[PDB]
Amino acid sequence: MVPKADLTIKATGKQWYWSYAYPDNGKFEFDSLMAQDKQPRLLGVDNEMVVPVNKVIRVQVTGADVIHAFALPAFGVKIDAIPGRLNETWFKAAKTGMFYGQCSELCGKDHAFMPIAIRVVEDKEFASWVETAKKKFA
């Protein structure tokens, strides 16, 4: 069962990146593309999924092209991202910081290079980030 959520984010797997939509924060969406100009190697991206600490985050998970899977080991999360299907999982981060995962379903050439990067922040910073993101992402 998915517990009562404080916020929902939709994570859509694509060849070979994730898109994150924020239905509860103004319906903006952005792509999260591997950077590696950035540490850690194979895990850093241009635009992280930002979430508030100490909140139930429902993650709706789907794919856009082929089957992917959303894996976030620090939270015990692993769920298929199947095009045509909206799956759901969740996590609650007990502390701030960076948390990383990977696509866990072989999905072609760049499967190994579509990381999930989550930045957990306090409420104040989350709200400030949302302000900026709404403008950045359109």
Q: Which is nearer to Cu ion, 57 or 107 (CB)?
A: 107
Q: Is 34 annotated as a binding residue?
A: no
Could you tell me whether strands 49-52 and 56-63 are parallel, antiparallel, or unpaired per DSSP bridges?
unpaired
Residue type, 54: N
User: Which of 14, 5, 9 shows the shortest CA–CA distance to 133?
Assistant: 9
Q: Which is nearer to Cu ion, 92 or 111 (CB)?
A: 111
In the stretch 91-110, what mask flags binding to Cu ion with x, by CB under 5 A?
Answer: ------------x---x---
Instruction: Please state the closest distance from residue 110 (CB atom) to Cu ion, in A.
Output: 8
Among 10, 111, 119, 134, binds Cu ion (CB under 5 A): 111
Instruction: Please state the closest distance from residue 91 (CB atom) to Cu ion, in A.
Output: 19
Instruction: Pick out residues in 36-55 that bind Cu ion (CB under 5 A).
Output: none
Check residue 68 for interaction with Cu ion (CB under 5 A).
yes
Selected range binding Cu ion among 21-29, 31-39, 50-58, 112-120, rule: CB under 5 A: 112-120
Task: Return the DSSP state at 34.
Answer: B
Query: Which are the contacts of 81, defined by CB distance < 8 A and separation ≥ 6?
Result: 11, 12, 13, 61, 62, 63, 67, 68, 69, 70, 87, 103, 105
Rounded Cα distance between 124 and 117, Å, is: 20
Residues that bind Cu ion (CB under 5 A): 68, 103, 107, 111, 114
